[PDB]
Write a protein that binds this ligand. Structure first.
Ligand code: CLA
Ligand code: CLA
Ligand code: CLA
Ligand code: CLA
Ligand code: CLA
Ligand code: CLA
Ligand code: CLA
Ligand SMILES: CCCCCCCCCCCCCCCCCC(=O)OC[C@H](CO[C@@H]1O[C@H](CO)[C@H](O)[C@H](O)[C@H]1O)OC(=O)CCCCCCCCCCCCCCCCC
Ligand SMILES: CC1=C(C#C/C(C)=C/C=C/C(C)=C/C=C/C=C(C)/C=C/C=C(\C)C#CC2=C(C)C[C@@H](O)CC2(C)C)C(C)(C)C[C@H](O)C1
Ligand SMILES: CC1=C(C#C/C(C)=C/C=C/C(C)=C/C=C/C=C(C)/C=C/C=C(C)/C=C/C2=C(C)CCCC2(C)C)C(C)(C)C[C@H](O)C1
Ligand SMILES: CC1=C(C#C/C(C)=C/C=C/C(C)=C/C=C/C=C(C)/C=C/C=C(C)\C=C\C2=C(C)CCCC2(C)C)C(C)(C)C[C@H](O)C1
Lengths: 139, 170, 169, 151, 174, 69, 104
């Protein structure tokens, strides 16, 4: 499961669009995927890179940058083998996506619903009713 | 500072004693810091004339000094096991095999240097107000009674609280 | 090599070659084929050898057809220019004949044609050396005599036998 | 041959290794500047930077300031530089108060004590360098003009 | 590891006792800025030119060639340059020394690569350096009178800029 | 105004020289096409003589300008 | 700054690529390769009968005679200086391209 740090990185010549000091002091994101070919893709941060046949590994500053690449890698290269990690400067590597092995748009058992409100959106409480009260506006 | 001051103190005394041939027909009757001024009024760049006396001193002292600049910079960063003041200058064997000299003779050098700093400072200020120069000042132990008319220096502002705030016995 | 001793031996030339002296300081032999280079040196030499006489003899005697101009150099501006045009095309015919249609570096030397040889014979290495060195000399002499007649605006031997005025322009 | 490469072998860091960024000439200048030179205390780094900055500060104030056409031009220019130096030192002090937690480390610039060392050196050097420029301009007529004394 | 000429300085890193004329004199560190072998070729070139320059100053005092007084009336040291640019002498010497410099430039590239020693043009027609021991002392003496002639050439031409006399006429007319 | 001269055989000579010069150059430097008897056609000949009349016209006008004629 | 020779120092044009700048050879060849053609004279008031290098080399000395004084706006020094350096920079650029890249 854990990120194998030794996975080779796509051939890239560098850009100014990569990550800055906040990645090495706050958090960094990584994406791995399997490629059947040695083909050119577009980096979210700049120009074009070449993914090596087999396993690739990137580091990006934002979670959205890893998923924007994942969207492109699945829409033009039909790679669905992508795993996104969060990396803290303490060395802790946090697996992110897909969170339970199944993509979010597919249902899975053992997923608990967060944020679900039992009524429709028009049935919320008026702000005056919950003024100087801790009660939440969602009923 | 001590070596320059020893040279300046001996220089002021001996300048009062005599002068080299032909110096008197050029500078005239100036005595100490004023002679520095007099040459500089007659030298290219600073003044207008056919002389380069203080400038030649600056040229060769400055060549030596940039050399010592590199020596001090090397000695500061620990790249050299050289002591302070040691330039290897000891042509006559006085330290009997070490140019640095003995502990006693460097203690002598430092102490005479400190004395000469004080002494040449005294001589410069005694000239700046009496105008007498070392040996006339030491002879004229009653002083301010009759003093030599001597020019304002190249830093005349410094002699502006003498009359207005200070007594100005002269 | 041996000519310019503070440089390396060219190592593209050898004492086998007719006029070899080890003199290739700029290393032109490295960048161009040496058969073509030899070829060009022999040809330039022979043309300039004819040119030295071409500047010398018309001073004494100019053909009755023409008018001699002022100097044998300046004579090309006073002979009919179509005469020089026919010289140019005649020399071109000789080039396309003596070379059997081969007029380029890739084309020459294909059947093993030796640079100097045009079929007038085979000569000793010494004899080929004589031709080369005399050719080199007449190249330098052609430069000297042409610019001499150009600057003096007078003939070569008349200038030499008469007061040897410096060349000035 | 290729002159541009990823920065420190990392293709995905936000920088490039260009001749301006990483030539031997650049590395030399950066490594030998007082901010980055080895064997320098933060106080000494401040002094060398301060002497440099204070010295050049005097000139624009003197030549182009409001009192430039007066005989108090050099005095006004020095005091203007001194005022800027004091304002800048307040900027340095407040940066140290808000940017660095208090730790024993003092030989680095980016520490609380090391910044306080550097600020101390910079103020002393700036006043020293401005004072040196004041002395030189006061005495040398070439510097008072733009070199216009020769014409 | 201290400099011989300047006892209080560290021995210059790029400098070595194998070099002819070495005394440990580089207090400014200029042997590190430019390549030492380029500097050696430059110094030796300066040495030989200024040796000819100093000897030329001295000889032009002592005598002049036949007909030179016709062309140069009163011009003595650098005035003769100004009048012989008008005549062809200076242009001639410039052309032929520049001709030689072309092969000197090839030889400088050669000594940069490392094939040739600086200042070494294999010009020993009279076999002066055949012994192998004289060759070293000749190298040392070449650099010594080369450096001395650089200083001397400067010191005469500036003495002539002052007085107009020229070297021997400066001495004989104090 | 730059002096130019009425057509003479000297003008013809420069033109002929320039045309031949380019015909030989065109055999060497035209990258897409028996030194002159291999692959020589009308578009190669019509191009080299077009550059000859460009080079020759420039040479004639320049040699008239400076006095060589 | 500094000059690197044809022979191998440890100078690197960037992070990890050593590259021999041929500052002696390029500067010498570019200077000579531009100055010698530029010797071509011209009876134009800017040149004055000399070439561009020589009229320029003449104008360095004339303005150096009046050493403190700068050359004026209508002085030929500025035009000669700009044209000479424009060709010189171009030959240096092209010379560096030719020598460093083609290596021969
Ligand atoms: C910076 C200081 C200084 C100044 C301004 C002078 C100026 C002068 N010196 Mg003095 N001199 C100096 C330092 C100085 N010297 C030193 C350090 C020494 C070494 C001890 C001498 C030794 C010296 C001697 C021995 C003589 C002079 C003489 C002269 C006068 C030369 C007149 C002439 O025709 O020259 C001709 C002389 C020379 C070019 C060299 C002697 C001239 C006014 C001469 C003099 O008094 O004649 C009037 C003279 O004979 N000078
Ligand atoms: C119809 C004309 C013609 C032609 C096709 C040739 C063909 C040849 N000559 Mg010949 N040649 C000719 C006329 C000609 N020549 C004449 C009239 C002369 C003067 C007597 C020469 C002198 C000559 C020499 C000295 C050499 C050749 C060489 C060559 C060969 C290679 C060059 C080439 O293909 O042509 C290129 C040549 C021409 C198109 C005509 C050349 C006529 C000259 C150069 C007049 C040019 C004026 C101008 C200064 C040229 C500079 C160009 C630019 C500054 C304007 C080839 C066998 C060279 C070689 O490698 O030996 C085989 C060689 O070394 N030839
Ligand atoms: C650039 C230097 C230079 C200059 C300007 C001159 C100029 C002159 N030389 Mg001299 N010459 C020179 C170098 C120079 N030469 C050198 C290096 C040598 C060899 C050592 C000679 C050897 C020489 C001789 C032998 C003669 C001249 C003569 C002449 C004059 C020619 C007069 C005549 O009737 O014929 C002329 C003014 C002649 C003359 O009349 O001089 C008195 C003469 O006989 N020259
Ligand atoms: C390679 C051959 C060569 C050739 C052809 C010339 C040709 C010439 N030289 Mg040059 N010269 C050369 C090599 C050469 N030089 C070398 C190697 C040097 C040493 C650097 C010089 C140094 C030199 C100087 C300094 C002078 C000449 C001069 C002359 C001119 C003499 C004119 C005269 O009346 O001659 C007849 C005279 C003789 C034959 C005398 C013997 C003529 C332009 C003179 C001149 O007027 O310059 C243009 C002049 O002053 N030459
Ligand atoms: C080989 C080296 C050498 C030699 C022997 C000389 C020798 C001489 N020079 Mg020259 N000089 C030299 C190098 C040399 N110089 C250099 C490298 C420069 C730098 C550009 C000068 C610049 C120079 C000037 C500007 C003057 C001299 C003068 C003198 C003379 C008097 C010495 C003097 O006043 O010094 C005094 C020595 C000391 C104070 C030593 C302590 C003397 C003939 C003077 C002279 O009379 O010429 C007209 C003069 O005015 N020299
Ligand atoms: C032997 C051949 C020869 C000679 C002597 C000349 C000589 C000349 N040409 Mg010509 N030219 C030639 C061949 C030749 N060219 C060839 C083969 C071409 C190619 C077609 C040209 C194309 C050409 C053009 C297009 C022009 C010239 C111009 C000029 C003249 C001025 C250039 C100048 O100083 O501008 C200096 C200008 C600068 C900006 C430089 C700084 C000059 C007399 C020009 C001119 O004024 O003619 C009247 C012009 O407009 N030439
Ligand atoms: C201004 C002078 C000049 C010019 C025009 C050239 C031109 C050329 N060189 Mg040369 N070179 C020069 C100086 C110059 N070089 C110097 C000083 C050196 C020594 C350090 C070299 C060393 C050198 C080598 C070692 C080699 C070349 C090669 C080449 C050719 C192609 C490569 C190149 O540089 O592209 C330049 C491309 C062009 C010039 C054509 C493009 C056309 C546009 C309009 C460019 C114009 C640029 C500029 C405005 C022209 C300025 C001219 C002047 C006013 C300064 C080309 C013909 C190579 C080659 O082909 O071998 C023969 C090769 O191997 N060069
Ligand atoms: C810690 C100190 C380290 C250095 C110490 C050196 C001296 C220490 C001991 C001194 C005690 C003896 C006194 C000797 C005094 C010598 C005086 C002297 O020689 O002065 C030397 C010089 C010039 O001063 C005079 O110059 C005159 C000609 O004008 C004469 O030639 C004299 O030689 C000289 O006295 O003064 C300076 O050094 C000024 C500082 C350097 C200035 C360089 C030129 C200016 C650069 C400006 C360009 C930058 C950009 C500008 C931006 C646009 C501006 C419009
Ligand atoms: C080192 C080295 C060498 C060397 C050397 C040299 C040249 C050494 C030079 C040494 C010198 C000159 C030392 C002089 C010190 C002067 C002093 C202490 C006096 C200060 C004045 C005072 C106290 C006063 C006063 C006064 C007051 C205030 C008022 C005035 O009106 C008058 C008055 C005078 C009374 C050599 C070459 C030998 C080789 C050797 O192998 C190594
Ligand atoms: C302009 C012009 C032309 C000309 C010309 C010519 C021929 C010009 C030549 C100029 C030259 C060669 C000047 C050299 C100056 C040497 C110096 C300053 C060295 C000083 C040594 C020092 C400071 C000390 C050194 C040292 C000492 C002992 C003490 C410390 C140690 C050390 C540092 C080693 C012409 C021909 C066109 C004519 C025209 O009409 C005018
Ligand atoms: C050439 C030139 C010039 C010049 C110049 C020069 C050379 C100026 C030199 C000035 C100097 C060296 C002054 C000395 C000051 C030392 C002092 C005041 C010590 C004071 C007091 C005490 C109590 C010491 C006490 C001490 C003792 C008793 C023992 C206890 C400890 C201690 C406290 C350390 C100008 C400027 C005139 C311009 C002119 O145009 C050209």
């Amino acid at each position: 499961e854990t990120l194998n740090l030794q996975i080779p990185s796509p051939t890239f010549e560098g850009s100014t669009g990569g990550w800055l000091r906040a990645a090495e002091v706050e958090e960094k994101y990584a994406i791995t995927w399997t490629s059947p070919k040695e083909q050119v893709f577009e980096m979210p941060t700049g120009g074009a890179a070449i993914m090596r046949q087999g396993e690739n590994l990137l580091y990006l500053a934002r979670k959205e940058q890893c998923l924007a690449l994942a969207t492109q890698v699945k829409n033009s290269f039909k790679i669905t083998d992508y795993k996104v990690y969060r990396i803290f400067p303490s060395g802790e590597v946090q697996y992110l996506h897909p969170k339970d092995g199944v993509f979010p748009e597919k249902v899975n058992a053992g997923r608990v619903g967060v944020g679900n409100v039992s009524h429709s959106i028009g049935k919320n409480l008026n702000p005056a009713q919950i003024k100087f009260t801790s009660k939440s506006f969602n009923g | 500072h001590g070596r320059v001051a020893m040279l300046a103190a001996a220089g002021a005394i001996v300048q009062d004693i005599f002068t080299f041939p032909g110096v008197k027909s050029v500078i005239g009757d100036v005595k100490m810091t004023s002679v520095h001024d007099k040459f500089l009024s007659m030298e290219a760049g600073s003044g207008k004339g056919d002389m380069a006396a203080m400038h030649q001193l600056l040229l060769w002292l400055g060549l030596l000094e940039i050399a010592t600049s590199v020596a001090i910079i090397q000695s500061f960063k620990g790249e050299t096991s050289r002591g302070p003041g040691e330039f290897g200058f000891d042509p006559l064997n006085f330290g009997k095999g070490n140019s640095a000299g003995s502990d006693s003779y460097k203690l002598k050098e430092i102490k005479n240097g400190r004395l000469a700093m004080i002494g040449i400072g005294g001589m410069v200020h005694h000239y700046l107000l009496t105008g007498k120069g070392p040996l006339q000042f030491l002879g004229g132990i009653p002083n301010y009674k009759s003093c030599v008319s001597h020019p304002d220096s190249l830093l005349p502002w410094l002699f502006k609280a003498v009359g207005p705030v200070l007594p100005k016995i002269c | 090599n041996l000519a310019v001793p503070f440089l390396k031996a060219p190592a593209k030339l050898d004492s086998s070659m007719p006029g070899y002296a080890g003199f290739d300081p700029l290393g032109c032999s490295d960048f161009y084929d040496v058969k073509w280079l030899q070829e060009a040196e022999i040809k330039n030499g022979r043309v300039a050898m004819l040119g030295v006489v071409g500047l010398l003899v018309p001073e004494f005697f100019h053909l009755p057809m023409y008018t001699a101009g002022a100097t044998p150099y300046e004579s090309y501006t006073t002979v009919p220019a179509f005469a020089l045009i026919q010289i140019f095309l005649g020399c071109g015919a000789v080039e396309y004949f003596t070379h059997k249609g081969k007029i380029s570096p890739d084309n020459m030397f294909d059947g093993g044609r030796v640079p100097g040889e045009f079929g007038w014979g085979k000569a000793d290495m010494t004899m080929q050396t004589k031709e080369i060195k005399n050719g080199r000399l007449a190249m330098l002499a052609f430069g000297g005599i042409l610019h001499q007649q150009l600057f003096t605006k007078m003939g070569t031997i008349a200038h030499l036998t008469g007061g040897f005025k410096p060349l000035t322009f | 041959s290729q002159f541009i490469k990823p920065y420190n072998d990392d293709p995905f860091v936000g920088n490039l290794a260009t001749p301006v960024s990483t030539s031997s000439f650049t590395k030399s200048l950066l490594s030998n500047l007082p901010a980055y030179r080895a064997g320098l205390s933060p106080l000494l780094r401040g002094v060398e930077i301060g002497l440099t900055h204070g010295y050049f500060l005097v000139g624009p104030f003197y030549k182009l300031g409001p009192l430039r056409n007066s005989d108090v031009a050099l005095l006004s220019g020095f005091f203007s530089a001194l005022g800027l130096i004091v304002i800048l030192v307040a900027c340095l002090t407040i940066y140290g108060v808000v940017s660095f937690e208090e730790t024993e480390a003092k030989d680095q610039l980016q520490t609380a004590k090391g910044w306080r060392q550097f600020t101390s050196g910079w103020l002393v050097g700036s006043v020293g360098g401005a004072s040196f420029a004041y002395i030189l301009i006061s005495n040398i007529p070439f510097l008072q003009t733009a070199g216009m004394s020769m014409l | 590891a201290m400099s011989e000429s300047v006892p209080f300085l560290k021995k210059p890193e790029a400098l070595d006792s194998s070099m002819a004329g070495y005394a440990g004199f580089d207090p400014l560190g200029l042997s590190s800025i430019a390549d030492i072998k380029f500097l050696q070729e430059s110094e030796i070139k300066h040495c030989r030119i200024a040796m000819l320059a100093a000897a030329g100053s001295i000889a032009q005092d002592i005598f002049t060639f036949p007909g030179v007084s016709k062309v140069v009336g009163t011009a003595k040291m650098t005035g003769v340059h100004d009048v012989l640019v008008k005549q062809g002498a200076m242009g001639q010497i410039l052309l032929w020394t520049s001709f030689l410099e072309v092969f000197g430039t090839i030889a400088l590239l050669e000594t940069l690569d490392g094939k040739r020693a600086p200042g070494d043009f294999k010009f020993d027609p009279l076999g002066f350096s055949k012994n192998a021991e004289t060759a070293k002392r000749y190298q040392l003496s070449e650099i010594k009178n080369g450096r001395l002639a650089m200083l001397a050439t400067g010191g005469m031409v500036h003495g002539y800029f002052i007085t107009g006399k020229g070297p021997l006429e400066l001495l004989t007319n104090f | 105004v730059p002096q130019t001269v009425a057509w003479s055989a000297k003008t013809g000579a420069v033109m002929v020289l320039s045309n031949i010069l380019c015909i030989v150059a065109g055999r060497y430097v035209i990258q897409v096409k028996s030194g002159s008897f291999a692959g020589f056609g009308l578009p190669e000949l019509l191009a080299s003589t077009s550059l000859g009349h460009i080079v020759g016209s420039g040479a004639i006008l320049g040699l008239s300008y400076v006095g060589v004629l | 700054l500094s000059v690197v020779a044809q022979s191998k120092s440890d100078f690197e044009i960037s992070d990890g690529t050593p590259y021999t700048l041929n500052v002696p050879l390029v500067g010498a060849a570019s200077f000579i390769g531009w100055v010698v053609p530029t010797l071509l004279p011209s009876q134009i008031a800017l040149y004055g009968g000399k070439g561009l290098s020589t009229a320029f080399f003449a104008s360095i000395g004339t303005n150096l005679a009046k050493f403190p004084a700068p050359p004026g706006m209508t002085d030929p020094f500025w035009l000669l200086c700009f044209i000479w350096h424009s060709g010189l920079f171009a030959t240096m650029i092209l010379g560096s391209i030719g020598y460093n890249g083609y290596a021969g």
